[PDB]
Amino acid sequence: GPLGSMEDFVRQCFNPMIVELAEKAMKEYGEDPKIETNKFAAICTHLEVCFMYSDFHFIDERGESIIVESGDPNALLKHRFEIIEGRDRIMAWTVVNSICNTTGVEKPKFLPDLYDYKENRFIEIGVTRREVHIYYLEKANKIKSEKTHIHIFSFTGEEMATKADYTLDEESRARIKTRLFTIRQEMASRSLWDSFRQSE
């Protein structure tokens, strides 16, 4: 087949808010989305996963955890997750600080991806083109000390999470894995996949 551009794939296959947030994140760290293109696509993917992880999950009027797929939820419902990723550094730490003072949870040394109000913990999400156990160990060894929960997804459907605790129901994680499969398949049809996989 013909080789497509990863730029084209990213703008066609991710929603514009994700793409924009990804561009902003790369600029913030001095990376150009038009050169580190595989990285661009990885950052978009990771962002989307963070959003999909939190999608639909609320804490009900009584304070337990429920799933609603409407577009208009009950306005007394609280979002189960805070989303830290996608925010610029100042706002990300502002949110982390607010969570920590309120819930009294310990302050992390690096910005995590999410906060889970049900489980009362920060979450580090990862999406890897390699084996989940290796990526898992890399992440665990970076965070130094841990209350932060780690949840790793791969493009082939494997997961690994701290203490074999996967946080979400199978259906939610299936949505995410289905999306990752679709990303991989679409990259493959544009002949972008083998390279994307090898660049991590």
7 part of the active site: no
Residues numbered 50 to 109 that lie near Ca ion (CB under 5 A) are: 85
Residue 108 CB burial class (10 angstroms; 0-12, 13-18, ≥19): buried
Q: Which is nearer to Ca ion, 85 or 116 (CB)?
A: 85
- The one catalytic residue in 82, 85, 116, 124 is 85
Q: Which is nearer to Ca ion, 58 or 126 (CB)?
A: 126
Closest approach, Cβ 41 to Ca ion, in A, equals 15
Starting at the edge strand found earlier in the chain, the sheet holding 57-59 runs 65-67, 57-59, 78-79
Residue 48 within binding range of Ca ion, rule CB under 5 A? no
d(CA 129, CA 135): 9
Triad 113, 100, 98: Cα angle to 5° = 85
169 part of the active site: no
d(CA 8, CA 34): 11
Closest approach, Cβ 27 to Ca ion, in A, equals 12
Q: Which is nearer to Ca ion, 58 or 84 (CB)?
A: 84
Active site residues: 85, 113, 139
Binding site for Ca ion (CB under 5 A): 85, 113
